Amino acid sequence: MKITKINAIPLSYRLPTVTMGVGSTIKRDAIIIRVETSEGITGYGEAHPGRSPGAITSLIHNTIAPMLIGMKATDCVGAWQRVHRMQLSSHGLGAGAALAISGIDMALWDIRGKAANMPLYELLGGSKRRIPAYAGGIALGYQPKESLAEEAQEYIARGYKALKLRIGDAARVDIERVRHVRKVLGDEVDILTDANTAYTMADARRVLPVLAEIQAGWLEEPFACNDFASYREVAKITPLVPIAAGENHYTRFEFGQMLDAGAVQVWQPDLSKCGGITEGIRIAAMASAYRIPINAHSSATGLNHAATIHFLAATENAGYFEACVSKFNPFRDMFGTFEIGADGCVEPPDAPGLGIEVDESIFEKYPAVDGPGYVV
Amino acid sequence: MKITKINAIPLSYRLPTVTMGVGSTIKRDAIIIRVETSEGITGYGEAHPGRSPGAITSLIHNTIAPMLIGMKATDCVGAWQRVHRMQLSSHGLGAGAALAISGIDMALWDIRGKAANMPLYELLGGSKRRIPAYAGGIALGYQPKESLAEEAQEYIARGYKALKLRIGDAARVDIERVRHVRKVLGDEVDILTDANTAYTMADARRVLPVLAEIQAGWLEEPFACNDFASYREVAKITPLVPIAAGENHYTRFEFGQMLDAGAVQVWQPDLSKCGGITEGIRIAAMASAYRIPINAHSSATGLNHAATIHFLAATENAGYFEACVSKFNPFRDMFGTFEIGADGCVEPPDAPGLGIEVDESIFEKYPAVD
Amino acid sequence: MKITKINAIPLSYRLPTVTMGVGSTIKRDAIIIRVETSEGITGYGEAHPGRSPGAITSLIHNTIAPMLIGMKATDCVGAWQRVHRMQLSSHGLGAGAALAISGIDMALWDIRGKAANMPLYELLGGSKRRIPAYAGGIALGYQPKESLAEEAQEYIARGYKALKLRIGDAARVDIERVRHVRKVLGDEVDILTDANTAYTMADARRVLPVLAEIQAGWLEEPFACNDFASYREVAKITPLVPIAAGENHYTRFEFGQMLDAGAVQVWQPDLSKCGGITEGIRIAAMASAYRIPINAHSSATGLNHAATIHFLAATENAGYFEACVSKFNPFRDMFGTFEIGADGCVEPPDAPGLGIEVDESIFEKYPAVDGPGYVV
Amino acid sequence: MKITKINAIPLSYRLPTVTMGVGSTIKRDAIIIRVETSEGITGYGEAHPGRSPGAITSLIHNTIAPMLIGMKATDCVGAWQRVHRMQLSSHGLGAGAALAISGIDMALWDIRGKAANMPLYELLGGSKRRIPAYAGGIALGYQPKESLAEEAQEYIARGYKALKLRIGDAARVDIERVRHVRKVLGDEVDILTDANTAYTMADARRVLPVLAEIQAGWLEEPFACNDFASYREVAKITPLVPIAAGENHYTRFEFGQMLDAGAVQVWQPDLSKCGGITEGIRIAAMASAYRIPINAHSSATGLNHAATIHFLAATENAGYFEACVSKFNPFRDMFGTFEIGADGCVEPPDAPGLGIEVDESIFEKYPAVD
Ligand SMILES: [Mg+2]
Ligand SMILES: [Mg+2]
Ligand SMILES: [Mg+2]
Ligand SMILES: [Mg+2]
């Protein structure tokens, strides 16, 4: 079974807005990858658009796809190694190639599930199990504290035992917001926080004590992805709340650097970013030996959501699934929906591969838009 | 003076080969950045193609240019900041965005020198001085040791006091090559080595002692850019030959990470890769306090070469300039040749900005190939 | 364009007093540097008097000026390197030479701005932007806590969102003072503290908890500039308030030593002390990679105030400008004033060089006085 | 007994040259400090000029003397403290103030020995003993290797068992010099080396192994005084030859910083630079617990030489005395010659205080030059 065609299909959706630390969201983009085989089996993956989806599309169509055509379709380790030496190790696009191979790998695993007649959790050695979820996605953004509390109440009513508050616009206001949410929900809900790379160190030494006071589960991404000196300096503030990162981190080599720095104790690789399922396993296994929980970051599509839940089912040190709960996200319920149970958990689809049926006539409903996706 | 237009112009050339540690070269690519201003002054830069020139071009035109139109063209610090917060810090393309800003930033400093009526060395605070150079680029590749020695002798005859040997294919064959060159050039030539990310650790503990024996200037890029664990292990082998890295390292935050690892003691940023001249200064200033020499890596075009020499003339802790000496390279001589003197040195051009005049009719001679 | 003449002009002013950790201020001194070029352009800088202004004057006129006459006037990097090898590296005056070259460098950059027809922020690559300021200078010294509160209220009325309280006479009294100021101003004002090298370690372990309680922005200079073991030992007290230093620190080499000690996380180089603008950039860039904010220390004259604001406009990791607010400081408003806005910010002058016009007939109004400047 | 007058007397001498790592010597300068008391006893010291003798003189007369007039002349600890809090700790001149207090402090100990009717070694708690010496000062500079060897042989014939070779101009030429001296003197002479802050790291990893090969006593000052990062890197090269530093290091707080860096294992304070005899004791006492030898650096005048020998006789962990052996140096023999014996050693004078009589009519013979 050889690889015949690899195609990157860029999709986008314009909405009539939720403010985070990265700015204000005006447009949602997604890149869906199709890999065709010699024996007729077709696999589907999702690559992250990287705030410039035309570039990842081009990178696949011009460089990465030709180096993988003709390869055996189950050899995703060998497929990953070609991208590693031609792009990741030297003179390449670095992080952009990781995004590109992430979707391809994901599609190759979908082929591998279909060829073995196994769902992905079974292919990886796990079982169909209940995986805890929190209300995340592009929701719970910057708004008055009482309105933010009401949105949080809506999610517990929907069965969530955990939620992720978006912080990082000003220390004072999100101290005020974070305190009010604990006040109205009680101390039974795992309140998680995400600063989305927007805090300084001065902000952190003000916010971290109140996070320990409200007993938050983690502080996610307080600084820039490459801000190494700030990441080691926050660890010194409080041991009662761990630092979380991984969304903007690529390959096991970047995660290995944050392993022996020892500051970030909660890892969140996005399978549409980090290098795919193959690299996801490698990252999680390193974390496993050091007892670090994997709370995977989720991308836009229900394809990535399928791959993530399958991955967490077979990953021993899996923590949370990040569930998108925003009302204006069509990529989530694009084909065959995940659904949260009353136990606060989620389940992988019981069908070969990723267990998602892809009708290609939905791509026409969400065409490519060349504009920017963010407002700061 | 505001920014009006930013365009990325892809150029490529097919050669009818020199093998290094990354592979075999069949086609050279380059991306030239044109920045137009509201007062008629036009800047030029080089962005590294990153093995996919169509992707960086797409990234510039769709994303990085729209966020920079309307900015004051002298504000390169602010221009770098917008790219830092929109692309480099969060959900962007990471390393690819750094290549894209590198050329734009270089073109911004070109505008700024012309508007100030100063050459770039003068703009950066330096003076026109002789900068030592080594014979490098896509030259001195894998070949028999006596043929490699004949190529080496030709560069000393042209004036060079230093050269860079390509190692990394097989441990035995490049120990054999490296020892032979020392005997035929004597111990007066600074012999530098580049492994082009092709060594393992098992190779390194076999090769490093002979590099000490021949008193090599540095071992450049023995491992992949993100291979942190190997880089810290090779520093334990010998203190007599330092490790060099920088080509595949982007922003001062990645260089900052290898500062406190302490393993790499020779920093080699590429101004067409690391973030431009702006980030080049910041990387070099950090190295300056730690007495780490900046031996900048050179890209394809004579634009990048001009910018690098201008940079090193004003940079306090500057080491060598990497001189491209392969003669199947039209990008170097594309618009008015650097020239190596009998002192083995090189001079910055004494004209406003980068000191290079760009005729756009030459772009048609080298069309873009996928 | 060559250098023709370098002249150090010592100035002083006697006042009919504000008490700090360095003692009681009775006389203010300043050294203004004039550099003349071959092409008629004249630049102006400020060197710190170093508590013995006759010595810096002598050092310039006898040693440093002759080694720089004939040099190209835009080659300030090369000018700095000559002073580095002849004075800073070996057998020299060390810190005194740094003060001397600071003013000369500053004057050379003023020439460079005028020759390029650019203001200094534009020459360094920045833009005209709003830079936050705090009430500093020789103000808010030792006095009864209620009178100290009234002086603080006057500055917020003048638009300051931040201020620097002078501490360090006794632990008990400035704990009492610091608590009262937070009480009357609310927790919206960034209260900064400066001990002016006067604390012991025993004082620090008493004062630092109350500073964390009142959430102070930093503790500036608790010990002697060379007191390395005390600087690393205070870092162990509280992570909620960082230690600040740099006023009495010279060259990037002394700042590099405090970088890898890792204790001081807020850097304050004085451009009239550290080695000038050239060295200022080098110090700030090292801090930039490690995400350390530069909150530059200000000297006496409006020349240094111009150079500082220009420097902070083009410095990416710039924090605060230290604004002198003392009523008896004529050096500040000596020629063409800075003015604080309602946003709590300050702006660089929009004119070539430092943007300050120097009338030399004001030097006669402030002649040199040979006496001491401090009382302890 | 109070302090009445403190005066700084600048002296200089033009020579019609010996090249070291800092440059070429054309004129030697010295500053002599006279401290008068209310009971008629007068002390003398030497302050280092710091390449600008007019500045230190100005600093003493305008600032440091006014803060010390009226103090009890035996209270040198309190005298050092006033200078510490007024000049060294905060907004002062830093390193220059340390040079200024060094001579005053030395003159204070001169008064104190005379008032106690004890020589300084006895005042410090030691006894008159033979102290090993090496041939140094502005001697054994850059010259052909055989001419350098002839100068070396002359010092062994005079009695010396140790000498200090000036290296640092070029790595090749001083490897050549250092090897030649070992062969012509044998392995019985302690060969010490001084680079005078002129090496890079690339030079060091080429030179250090040959210094190990020739079994050199130490490598003195390879880098600038504040070049912290290089000093920690050279300790990694070879454990067989230690690094020496101290000439350009002031107060026990800078020596304390190089204690916990662990890189420099031979400390060389200058009593005319580091803070005087008072600070000299404190620097040496810290070194004593860590078993670091104190091989003090010598200044210009025979006053400083007298103070140094007195100091080392009473100092537990004293190593070598630096003997100035250049014969174009009148400051050494200015008022009654030290003398080297056949044991290669040197003795402190057996007279109250520093044991030197100062005739002020000799000051006219060496007037001050700008
Ligand atoms: Mg996130
Ligand atoms: Mg290379
Ligand atoms: Mg202060
Ligand atoms: Mg010496």
XYZ file of C-alpha atoms in Angstrom, chain A residues 22 48-56 58-59 62-63 84-96 99 196-197 221 223-228 232 247-248 250-254 256-257 260 273 297 370-371 374 376, chain B residues 22-23 48-56 58-60 62-63 84-97 99 196-197 221 223-228 232 247-248 250-254 256-257 260 273 297 370:
108
model
C -3.772 36.686 21.466
C -2.888 24.047 11.842
C -3.083 27.164 9.587
C -0.333 28.941 11.580
C -1.989 32.389 11.142
C -1.002 32.213 7.440
C -2.803 29.169 5.908
C -1.542 29.867 2.364
C 2.018 29.147 3.517
C 1.311 25.678 4.994
C 2.178 25.823 -0.296
C 4.736 23.995 1.904
C 5.587 22.072 -3.189
C 8.008 20.394 -0.752
C 12.759 15.641 10.205
C 15.956 15.588 8.128
C 14.754 17.694 5.172
C 12.928 20.417 7.130
C 13.168 20.196 10.928
C 16.902 19.629 11.458
C 18.402 22.085 8.944
C 17.752 25.104 6.687
C 13.953 24.703 6.766
C 10.749 26.348 7.956
C 11.053 24.763 11.416
C 7.730 25.130 13.209
C 5.752 25.406 9.956
C 2.280 21.872 11.463
C -2.444 33.185 26.023
C 1.164 34.527 26.057
C 0.883 29.847 28.611
C 4.471 34.088 28.180
C 5.774 33.740 24.620
C 6.616 30.184 23.497
C 10.342 31.001 23.355
C 10.403 33.030 26.613
C 12.628 30.550 28.488
C 11.782 29.303 34.875
C 0.209 24.606 22.422
C 2.942 26.558 20.635
C 6.788 21.491 18.237
C 8.531 18.060 18.251
C 9.830 16.046 21.241
C 13.019 18.113 21.179
C 11.315 21.346 22.267
C 12.652 17.768 26.059
C 14.158 21.215 26.639
C 15.121 19.446 31.920
C 0.856 21.268 15.682
C -4.628 21.197 23.141
C -7.079 35.528 2.353
C -7.495 38.117 5.165
C -6.962 38.382 14.560
C -5.143 43.423 18.661
C 22.448 17.926 4.460
C 22.514 16.415 0.944
C 16.068 32.791 3.322
C 13.772 30.438 1.306
C 13.784 27.697 3.984
C 13.753 24.882 1.369
C 10.266 26.091 0.338
C 10.480 29.596 -1.238
C 6.785 29.615 -2.213
C 5.775 29.347 1.448
C 7.824 32.342 2.697
C 3.020 33.475 0.583
C 3.631 34.323 4.264
C 5.014 37.772 3.390
C -0.760 37.448 2.775
C 0.195 38.072 6.415
C 6.998 39.141 17.299
C 3.518 39.353 18.842
C 1.551 38.217 15.759
C 3.802 35.427 14.479
C 6.737 34.546 16.724
C 5.202 34.435 20.216
C 1.942 32.501 19.768
C 0.089 30.498 17.098
C 2.240 31.424 14.079
C 4.710 29.697 11.772
C 7.619 30.070 14.219
C 10.934 29.734 12.389
C 9.497 30.628 8.962
C 8.243 34.008 10.175
C 13.126 34.277 7.840
C 26.085 20.330 8.618
C 23.957 18.569 11.296
C 26.778 22.347 13.501
C 23.837 18.057 15.244
C 20.302 19.209 14.422
C 19.296 22.679 15.639
C 16.911 21.370 18.303
C 19.173 18.483 19.430
C 19.855 20.074 22.842
C 25.682 19.596 25.881
C 22.581 29.102 10.950
C 19.432 27.300 12.022
C 16.164 32.176 15.095
C 15.594 35.169 17.418
C 17.621 36.148 20.500
C 15.440 33.813 22.593
C 16.926 30.708 20.959
C 19.629 33.050 24.842
C 18.805 29.383 25.433
C 22.834 29.403 29.543
C 17.442 33.949 9.052
C 26.671 32.856 8.394
C 8.948 24.976 -7.747
